[PDB]
């Protein structure tokens, strides 16, 4: 049929942030820093608006891979605030003709 071996996964996170917060993704595999805050992936606020307070990042991950992950907020002090437990979980899909995936999460 044709299943790719890599999937570009977009993590769309709804999160209301103050000026000077940045948002990172960290998770349980080496691509997501494994689980080190300093190896986490910076999300962009390019698409953030008042009615849709969206941060996002796209990460190419290998198909069929599972992991756990959390988002973290870093205020200017590099005080870290982590999401609440539990860890979130995801499996990158493995499906015919599918090279993109979207994960839709809301800070909690």
UniProtKB/Swiss-Prot annotation:
Question: Which residues are in coiled coils?
Answer: none
According to the entry, every stretch annotated as the CBM20 domain falls at: 1-108
For bias type Polar residues, the affected ranges are 96-108
| Residue ranges of the region described as Disordered | 84-108
On the tree of life, the source organism's domain of life is: Eukaryota
Question: Glycosylation annotated at which residues?
Answer: 2-3
Q: Record's family?
A: Belongs to the glycosyl hydrolase 15 family.
State what protein this is by name. Answer: Glucoamylase
Q: Which organism is it from?
A: Aspergillus niger
What is the phylogenetic placement of the source species in the record?
Answer: Eukaryota, Fungi, Dikarya, Ascomycota, Pezizomycotina
Whole-protein residues included: 533 to 640 of 640
